[PDB]
């Protein structure tokens, strides 16, 4: 038994004309979502966005869609992102590292997107049900039989 399912990671960034009072030059938004017409809430319990230490309360949790964070800042950084599953066995979660980069003056706003495919070996029937409700496919080996004589 094998279940394959997909996730989307992305972010948008925009250069401000006039910086904020804190000197922030960009407004940005980072998100986790499913492919077109796939509600990952079926199998995702929560998403934790680990912002840089310079933000207040940088451990940002989304327990329900939209799974996203909207902020303002002056510099890009690598953002660890944890997608937690509605699963009582391991794996309980999956960890990504996302490059939240900002655009230079003269380049268009950022609209970056990533597609990630998760593969689970023999998930519990309850969890595999949730994955198949969100665009997954289940694959099960069977006994093969040849079509010709020898």
């Amino acid at each position: 038994c094998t279940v394959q399912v997909r996730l989307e990671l992305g972010h948008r960034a925009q250069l401000r004309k006039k910086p904020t009072t804190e000197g922030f030059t960009h407004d940005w938004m980072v998100f986790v979502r499913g492919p077109e017409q796939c509600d990952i809430q079926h199998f995702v319990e929560k998403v934790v966005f680990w912002l840089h230490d310079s933000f207040p309360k940088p451990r940002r949790v989304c327990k329900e869609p939209p799974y996203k964070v909207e902020e303002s800042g002056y510099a890009g950084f690598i953002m660890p992102i944890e997608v937690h599953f509605k699963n009582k066995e391991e794996p309980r979660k999956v960890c990504f590292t996302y490059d939240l980069f900002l655009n230079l003056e003269g380049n268009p706003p950022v609209n970056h997107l990533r597609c990630e495919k998760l593969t689970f070996n023999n998930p519990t029937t309850e969890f595999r049900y949730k994955l198949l409700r969100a665009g997954g496919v289940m694959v099960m080996p069977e006994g093969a039989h040849h079509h010709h004589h020898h």
């Binding site: 840089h52 230490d53 310079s54 510099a75 890009g76 950084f77 690598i78 900002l102 655009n103």
Partner: peptide, 6 residues
């Protein structure tokens, strides 16, 4: 651009 680190 400038970046931040951990």
């Amino acid at each position: 651009a400038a970046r931040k680190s951990a």
